Amino acid sequence: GPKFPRVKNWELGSITYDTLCAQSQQDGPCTPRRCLGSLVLPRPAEQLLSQARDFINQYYSSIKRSGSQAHEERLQEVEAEVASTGTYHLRESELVFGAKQAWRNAPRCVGRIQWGKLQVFDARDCSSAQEMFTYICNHIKYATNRGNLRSAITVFPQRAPGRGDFRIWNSQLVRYAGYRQQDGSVRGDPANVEITELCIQHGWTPGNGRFDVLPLLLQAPDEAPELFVLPPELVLEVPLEHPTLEWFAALGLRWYALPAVSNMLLEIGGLEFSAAPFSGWYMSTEIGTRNLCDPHRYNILEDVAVCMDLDTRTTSSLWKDKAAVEINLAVLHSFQLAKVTIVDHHAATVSFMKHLDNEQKARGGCPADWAWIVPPISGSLTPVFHQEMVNYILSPAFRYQPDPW
Amino acid sequence: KFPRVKNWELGSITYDTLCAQSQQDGPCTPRRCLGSLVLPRKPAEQLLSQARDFINQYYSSIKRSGSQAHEERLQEVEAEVASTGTYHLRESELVFGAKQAWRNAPRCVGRIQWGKLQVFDARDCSSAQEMFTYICNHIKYATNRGNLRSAITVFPQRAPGRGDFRIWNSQLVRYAGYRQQDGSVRGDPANVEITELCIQHGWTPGNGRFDVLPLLLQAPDEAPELFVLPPELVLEVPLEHPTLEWFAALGLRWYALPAVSNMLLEIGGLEFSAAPFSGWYMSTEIGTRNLCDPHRYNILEDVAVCMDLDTRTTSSLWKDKAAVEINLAVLHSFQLAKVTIVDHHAATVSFMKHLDNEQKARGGCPADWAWIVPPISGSLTPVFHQEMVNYILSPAFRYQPDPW
Ligand code: HEM
Ligand code: HEM
Ligand SMILES: Cc1cc(N)nc2cc(CNCCc3ccc(C#N)cc3)ccc12
Numbered sequence: 176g177p178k179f180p181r182v183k184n185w186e187l188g189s190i191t192y193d194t195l196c197a198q199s200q201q202d203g204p205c206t207p208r209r210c211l212g213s214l215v216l217p218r219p220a221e222q223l224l225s226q227a228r229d230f231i232n233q234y235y236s237s238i239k240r241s242g243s244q245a246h247e248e249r250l251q252e253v254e255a256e257v258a259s260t261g262t263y264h265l266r267e268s269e270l271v272f273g274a275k276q277a278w279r280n281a282p283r284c285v286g287r288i289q290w291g292k293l294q295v296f297d298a299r300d301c302s303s304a305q306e307m308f309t310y311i312c313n314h315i316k317y318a319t320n321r322g323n324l325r326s327a328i329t330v331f332p333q334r335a336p337g338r339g340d341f342r343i344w345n346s347q348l349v350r351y352a353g354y355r356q357q358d359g360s361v362r363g364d365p366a367n368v369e370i371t372e373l374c375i376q377h378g379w380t381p382g383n384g385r386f387d388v389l390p391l392l393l394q395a396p397d398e399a400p401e402l403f404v405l406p407p408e409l410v411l412e413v414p415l416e417h418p419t420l421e422w423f424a425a426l427g428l429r430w431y432a433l434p435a436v437s438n439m440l441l442e443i444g445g446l447e448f449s450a451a452p453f454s455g456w457y458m459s460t461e462i463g464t465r466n467l468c469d470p471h472r473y474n475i476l477e478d479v480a481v482c483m484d485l486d487t488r489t490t491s492s493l494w495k496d497k498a499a500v501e502i503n504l505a506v507l508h509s510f511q512l513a514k515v516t517i518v519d520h521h522a523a524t525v526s527f528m529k530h531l532d533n534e535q536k537a538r539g540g541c542p543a544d545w546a547w548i549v550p551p552i553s554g555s556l557t558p559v560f561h562q563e564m565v566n567y568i569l570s571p572a573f574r575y576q577p578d579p580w
Numbered sequence: 581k582f583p584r585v586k587n588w589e590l591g592s593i594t595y596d597t598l599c600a601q602s603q604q605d606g607p608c609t610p611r612r613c614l615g616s617l618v619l620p621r622k623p624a625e626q627l628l629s630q631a632r633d634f635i636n637q638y639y640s641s642i643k644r645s646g647s648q649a650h651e652e653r654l655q656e657v658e659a660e661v662a663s664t665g666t667y668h669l670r671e672s673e674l675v676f677g678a679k680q681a682w683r684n685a686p687r688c689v690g691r692i693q694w695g696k697l698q699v700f701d702a703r704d705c706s707s708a709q710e711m712f713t714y715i716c717n718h719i720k721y722a723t724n725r726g727n728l729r730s731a732i733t734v735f736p737q738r739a740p741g742r743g744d745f746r747i748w749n750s751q752l753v754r755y756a757g758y759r760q761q762d763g764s765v766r767g768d769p770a771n772v773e774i775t776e777l778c779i780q781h782g783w784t785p786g787n788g789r790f791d792v793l794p795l796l797l798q799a800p801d802e803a804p805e806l807f808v809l810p811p812e813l814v815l816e817v818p819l820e821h822p823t824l825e826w827f828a829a830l831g832l833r834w835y836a837l838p839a840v841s842n843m844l845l846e847i848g849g850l851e852f853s854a855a856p857f858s859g860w861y862m863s864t865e866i867g868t869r870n871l872c873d874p875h876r877y878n879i880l881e882d883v884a885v886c887m888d889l890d891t892r893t894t895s896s897l898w899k900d901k902a903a904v905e906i907n908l909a910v911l912h913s914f915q916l917a918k919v920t921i922v923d924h925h926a927a928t929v930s931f932m933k934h935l936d937n938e939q940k941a942r943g944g945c946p947a948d949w950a951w952i953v954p955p956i957s958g959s960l961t962p963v964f965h966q967e968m969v970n971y972i973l974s975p976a977f978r979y980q981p982d983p984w
């Protein structure tokens with residue numbers, strides 16, 4: 176009936192219509208002819224004004240003062256600013272509204288039922304690579320909260336016309352090193368080879384563990400990146416052990432407790448925040464399945480499989496499956512033991528169902544990227560597998576951005 | 581420009597320029613992506629222009645475009661359409677179409693096999709009665725005593741101002757689902773509607789968890805007649821776990837032939853509303869979906885209780901654990917009974933070569949990423965890390981409304 180996407184859940188037979196996507200005024204990667212939905216990365220005062228106006232509108236609507244004289248005065252104030260400085264500034268609580276919106280608007284995040292509880296740290300005053308380090312340390316301390324993790328974000332100055340961006344070069348605040356070996360292999364995390372090399376070029380004296388935390392490479396505007404090392408006590412880690420296979424502890428596997436992305440642009444009302452790191456806490460398959468078992472990461476599947484005594488000779492033993500499950504069980508049980516916040520793929524996807532059900536009533540939809548929302552193990556076994564999803568770009572958004580170098 | 585496709589496990593990059601040949605539209609626009617939707621939302625030289633293409637496709641396939649045989653065939657088709665508003669395909673053209681329709685189905689992980697397909701021309705069918713005979717034969721050939729074989733049977737095309745040949749059942753083999761007034765459901769919940777359609781057309785229902793349903797066959801503009809499969813055509817496998825003794829006690833079992841009745845074959849503009857096709861199972865279809873899906877047989881918890889696992893909390897991964905034991909029992913049983921089957925690992929590996937062959941022959945391969953990745957152990961298989969482009973090529977297998 177309705178001229179909007181029909182959306183069906185096949186477990187339950189229930190149907191919904193996404194009316195929110197009518198607000199998506201950025202084009203994604205698909206067209207009538209080809210669907211590029213599996214792609215990870217597909218690729219003026221005039222222009223700013225219209226975005227700004229749309230954000231202020233979103234904001235005043237969020238506090239139910241739409242069309243009020245507060246609202247229409249703010250708007251005038253902004254055009255005034257864009258008029259003389261070619262840009263405009265945000266208010267504290269605007270900023271906070273946007274930072275939560277970009278989280279809420281983020282299609283690849285199963286964790287969004289929490290989008291409301293986000294501590295936003297204003298660092299728009301920060302003026303040095305030194306001070307960035309200080310802000311970042313505060314964040315890590317706060318978000319970690321001794322293993323009782325608290326989602327948070329820290330926002331450094333926005334892009335100014337004709338001036339260097341605040342940029343953090345590492346992809347995450349915590350990243351194990353990747354050491355290109357003499358024989359050709361990589362010691363540690365192969366995902367992090369290039370940054371590991373860059374720290375080195377910039378002065379890092381490098382270890383040779385599998386699990387060496389990298390220093391940060393913080394860049395203030397128009398200045399060469401500066402190297403900062405994290406105090407080992409600030410970086411909580413969890414040693415991985417298994418609840419019934421006593422040998423698993425012997426593999427010496429560790430993961431860090433805090434997932435903190437630091438290379439993503441945060442966009443609000445057309446304002447671009449190039450340094451704006453945020454943190455939540457892990458879903459257990461991020462560690463157990465992708466980070467530890469991906470062919471092109473630590474690739475520890477055959478190794479566990481062999482200790483397990485499995486038939487790694489043939490696919491049909493499902494030796495890969497048995498191994499990956501027990502590795503995931505180990506990530507779960509270890510974090511639990513350590514009193515570090517962790518959520519399994521079942522419980523996370525159940526909560527996302529509730530989120531969808533929530534956002535249905537609240538906005539008439541929730542933009543979602545099915546491929547990224549369905550766990551990388553036991554897909555069919557989680558509710559979101561059977562849940563059709565519409566994906567579109569809403570703003571404020573978290574965007575990808577070129578590596579500074 | 582043209583889509584840039586990357587493998588995130590190897591670092592390789594391809595370019596799908598075969599997508600440039602899609603002339604059907606998909607559910608997506610630039611503002612919204614509806615790739616995850618299971619179904620869509622639902623004059624005469626358009627037909628001709630579909631036929632002219634297919635004929636060119638066919639003659640280019642056998643290395644003879646522009647030639648005489650091509651030229652004439654083009655005009656044959658033109659003339660038959662101009663005078664009758666439709667036309668017909670010669671059997672070798674049909675066999676080609678049917679094989680392309682398999683090759684182009686973006687949801688199939690098994691297309692490494694696409695050249696090896698037995699085509700039965702059954703367009704000289706004029707009754708429910710004949711339909712049944714053609715189907716009984718499909719099964720015996722395709723089943724092939726458990727050494728399974730890919731086959732399609734093509735019943736007469738749709739025709740303007742006449743009803744359609746239809747097979748009402750979703751698959752030639754399905755288990756009856758009886759809704760018991762207790763809210764609950766005996767058998768396969770996915771099959772309740774068709775079970776009742778069967779009952780009401782005078783089928784004598786059983787009350788087992790795995791009751792093989794009869795076939796409702798419908799020749800044009802007549803009521804569907806009801807035929808019963810001879811038990812020795814329905815090859816079934818009992819499930820049993822290679823190390824868990826107690827598993828065979830579960831009385832589980834699944835048929836061997838996955839054959840689909842309700843889809844529509846489209847070739848050069850012609851539509852075939854009855855054209856069932858079969859292959860062999862991939863183990864996860866049975867082990868994960870059909871037995872563990874909450875809305876199917878849903879045996880996840882029972883098995884888990886039998887494994888003495890911890891139902892109490894999700895974080896013991898009991899769901900995951902039980903599932904893997906199930907998929908194993910399906911791989912065990914089938915391999916023990918010498919019934920063709922393939923595990924999800926073996927399957928996606930072959931698909932990767934298929935992707936590579938396709939990239940070299942046509943410059944691409946239409947793939948539905950969400951359907952290619954198995955229902956367990958996603959990233960544990962190489963297709964997870966492979967970007968895919970999706971689009972509708974013709975010939976094509978399509979969905980179509982149930983005939984009621
Ligand atoms: C609080 C618990 C959270 C959980 C369990 C969670 C879970 C996840 C997971 C599992 C992914 C996919 C990761 C991958 O495979 O790369 C993801 C992606 C994402 N999350 Fe969340 N998240 C949480 C908090 C947050 C917060 C606080 C924010 C923003 C302030 C956020 C923003 C995002 C974004 C933008 C992505 C997309 C990643 C990308 O585009 O590369 N998440 N999240
Ligand atoms: C020979 C071994 C084969 C294997 C292992 C295989 C595997 C699969 C799998 C796993 C699916 C996903 C279906 C689902 O999850 O429900 C699928 C779908 C599909 N396959 Fe294959 N297949 C095989 C043969 C064939 C043949 C012979 C044809 C056609 C002649 C075919 C065409 C299709 C089509 C059209 C779909 C989409 C089904 C739908 O939309 O419901 N495949 N196949
Ligand atoms: C807040 C957050 C929480 C959480 N639990 N997990 C989180 C995981 C991420 C991980 N996103 C990175 C995934 C990726 C994207 C692009 C490319 C490339 N090229 C390589 C990898 C980000 C934020 C997270």
Ligand SMILES: Cc1cc(N)nc2cc(CNCCc3ccc(C#N)cc3)ccc12
Nearest residue numbers: 618619838839840857858859860861862865
């Ligand atoms: C050739 C073939 C081979 C094989 N191994 N498995 C195969 C499985 C199928 C199963 N497709 C059914 C999936 C579906 C589609 C639409 C709706 C609806 N509405 C509900 C379920 C078809 C063909 C197969």
Ligand SMILES: C[C@H](O)[C@H](O)[C@H]1CNc2nc(N)[nH]c(=O)c2N1
Nearest residue numbers: 213214215546547964965966967
């Ligand atoms: C090619 C494909 O998009 C890629 O492997 C995706 C698949 N799904 C994913 N899902 C999540 N959550 N994170 C990922 O990095 C990916 N990678």
Ligand SMILES: C[C@H](O)[C@H](O)[C@H]1CNc2nc(N)[nH]c(=O)c2N1
Nearest residue numbers: 560561562563616617618950951
């Ligand atoms: C909603 C979701 O797209 C739907 O359940 C899909 C997901 N992927 C699938 N993949 C396969 N192979 N078969 C399916 O039936 C489905 N179902």
Ligand SMILES: [Zn+2]
Nearest residue numbers: 205210613615
């Ligand atoms: Zn799409």
